């Protein structure tokens, strides 16, 4: 709340509006925390916010899954076992046991 208020006098006083470090001096605190405070303060945007074209295209339709695993990798995972399991039968029974162990 204090921040909105400060931007007010300084809004017309500075003629455009105070710089990110301006209200920082106006405020008691470390003043770089302004940035940190400013992030969490934003309210989340409706994932249903209709974007462009109005075509029921909605913001949420554009949010990709980053936790997924592309198959071109999962495929190489199924392979990497077959790779390493083979090279470990190519070694002595104890080296495979010792390496599978370490």
Map the footprint of other proteins across residues 3-62, applying CB under 8 A: 8-9, 11-13, 15-17, 19-21, 35, 38-39, 42-50, 56, 59-62
What CA–CA distance (Å, rounded) separates 35 from 77?
42
Contacts of 100 (CB under 8 A, 6+ apart): 88
Instruction: Confirm or reject binding of residue 79 to other proteins (CB under 8 A).
Output: yes
The pair phi, psi for residue 40, each rounded to 5°, is: -60, -25
In angstroms, what is the minimal distance from the CB of 20 to other proteins?
7
Among residues 75, 95, 97, 98, which is the contact residue for other proteins, using CB under 8 A? Answer: 75
Q: For residues 48 and 59, is the Cβ–Cβ distance under 8 A?
A: yes
| Binding residues for other proteins, total number by CB under 8 A | 48
SS3 82: helix
What CA–CA distance (Å, rounded) separates 29 from 23?
10
Binding residues for other proteins, per CB under 8 A?
Answer: 8-9, 11-13, 15-17, 19-21, 35, 38-39, 42-50, 56, 59-66, 68-72, 74-76, 78-81, 83-84, 99, 102
């Amino acid at each position: 709340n204090k921040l909105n208020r400060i931007s007010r006098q300084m809004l017309q006083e500075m003629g455009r509006e105070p710089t990110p470090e301006e209200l920082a001096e106006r405020m008691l605190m470390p003043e770089d925390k302004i940035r940190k405070v400013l992030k969490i303060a934003k309210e989340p945007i409706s994932m249903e916010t209709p974007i462009g074209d109005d075509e029921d295209s909605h913001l949420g339709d554009f949010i990709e899954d980053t936790t997924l695993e592309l198959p071109l990798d999962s495929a190489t995972t199924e392979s990497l076992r077959a790779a390493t399991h083979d090279v470990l039968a190519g070694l002595t029974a104890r080296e495979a046991k010792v390496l599978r162990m370490r």
